[PDB]
Design a binder for this molecule. Structure first.
Ligand code: ZN
Ligand code: ZN
Ligand code: ZN
Lengths: 188, 88, 167
């Protein structure tokens, strides 16, 4: 009911780790088993709460939120999926390494969960500029890994975006780092 | 009777706060010694687990003392921020 | 009403219980202490007929052995016989009180007493004492109804496992 969701959301900010871990586990196990009559405002609060918890200072809560992100996207309106993808993409470019790793893991989990078309198009549009020859080697590595995983999972779609992917991947073959060369070879 | 000379030396050292490494902040007993409540009772199964607990801020506290402190307060006593267990 | 209040004053050791030739190593002294809600041994204060005291023993011995009140007495014995400075009762003292209090009521008191001597050389916690009486009440001769995955302490189940082959 709405009361249970409200109390879980309220207790998710109890400043105590045990309370923060139990409520998130309850939310995850409720979403995993046929969540009933979740009003749009409840989706909004749940998405915002999970995104904020992804920045928590304890590893256990962040890991549980990352795992919960998967079953969440199974039943939500497409707009929340788009804004979650956008938030993960902009957090991937953050200077903090923990945020980059968390966003990459969340995006990989989302890609693995997804069997839907516009999400992949937006992700590819972001990664095309991400992989470009810039001064951040780690960002290039993460974007290459994400695109390789996305291509391995599904390749039937993105018919019109393949030339752009090839055009961005080709200059990476002469990068001084051999790991970049191997990763772009795998992506090709 | 021989002559030996050293060309180079490599050493590894560990750093910790000197205020609390010698003795716990909660209890003034030695860090390697048993806690205050583990000394009066010395014939129980809880006296064979009193070890050192470390955190992110490299603060060393007795496991029982920090567990009792984290029952009504959720901050590390010396740095005044959220405490997270790192090693035992 | 009168002349009874001065008994404590003149009292203020077997001489304390000369009304019935009682002995300190007996059930009745600790039963009376439980009736007087003494915190520990030989703990008396000013807050608390001779024929009435003499006749008290038959009746409240008869009444205490009934269930319910005996549960409260058994619970109070732990705090009465324990020093305030330690949460765990000593092994020898616990064995002595097991002999004194559970005389005959426990089916396997003699066998249970020989245990935790060459194996469990540690103090007894409060939870085992509380559940020992329930275990004795529920136990049977064959000991086939016991469960190893229940709500019993790790001492009771290991004692059951040790005593199972010998019967
Ligand atoms: Zn201790
Ligand atoms: Zn301590
Ligand atoms: Zn600290």
């Amino acid at each position: 009911a709405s009361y249970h969701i409200s109390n879980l959301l309220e207790k998710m900010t109890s400043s105590d780790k045990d309370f923060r871990f139990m409520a998130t586990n309850d939310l995850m196990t409720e979403l995993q088993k046929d969540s009933i009559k979740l009003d749009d405002d409840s989706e909004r609060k749940v998405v915002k709460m999970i995104l904020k918890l992804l920045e928590d200072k304890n590893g256990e809560v962040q890991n549980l939120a990352v795992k919960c992100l998967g079953p969440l996207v199974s039943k939500v309106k497409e707009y929340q999926v788009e804004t979650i993808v956008d938030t993960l993409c902009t957090n991937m470019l953050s200077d903090k390494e923990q945020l980059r790793d968390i966003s990459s893991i969340g995006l990989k989990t989302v890609i693995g969960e997804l069997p839907a078309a516009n999400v992949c198009k937006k992700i590819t549009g972001r990664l095309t500029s991400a992989i470009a020859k810039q001064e951040d080697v780690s960002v290039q590595l993460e974007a290459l890994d994400i695109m390789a995983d996305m291509l391995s999972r599904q390749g039937g779609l993105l018919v019109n975006f393949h030339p752009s992917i090839l055009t961005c991947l080709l200059p990476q073959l002469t990068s001084p780092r051999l790991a970049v060369r191997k990763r772009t070879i795998i992506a090709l | 009777k021989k002559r030996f000379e050293v060309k180079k030396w490599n050493a590894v050292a560990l750093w910790a706060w000197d205020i609390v490494v010698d003795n716990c902040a909660i209890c003034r007993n030695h860090i390697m010694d048993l806690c205050i409540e583990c000394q009066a009772n010395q014939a129980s199964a809880t006296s064979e687990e009193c070890t050192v607990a470390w955190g992110v801020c490299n603060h060393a506290f007795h496991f029982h003392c920090i567990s009792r402190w984290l029952k009504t307060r959720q901050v590390c006593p010396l740095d005044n921020r959220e405490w997270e267990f790192q090693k035992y | 009403r009168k002349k009874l209040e001065q008994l404590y004053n003149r009292y203020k050791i077997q001489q304390f219980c000369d009304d019935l030739a009682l002995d300190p190593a007996s059930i009745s002294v600790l039963i009376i202490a439980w009736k007087f809600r003494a915190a520990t041994q030989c703990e008396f204060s000013k807050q608390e007929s001779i024929e009435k005291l003499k006749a008290q023993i038959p009746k409240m011995e008869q009444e205490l052995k009934e269930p319910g009140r005996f549960k409260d007495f058994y619970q109070f014995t732990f705090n009465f016989a324990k020093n305030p400075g330690q949460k765990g009762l000593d092994l020898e003292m616990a064995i002595a009180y097991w002999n004194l209090v559970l005389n005959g009521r426990f089916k396997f008191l003699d066998l249970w007493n020989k245990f935790l001597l060459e194996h469990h050389k540690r103090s007894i916690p409060k939870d085992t004492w509380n559940l020992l009486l329930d275990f004795s009440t529920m136990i049977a001769d064959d000991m086939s109804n016991y469960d190893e995955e229940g709500a019993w302490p790790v001492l009771i189940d290991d004692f059951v496992e040790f005593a199972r082959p010998q019967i």
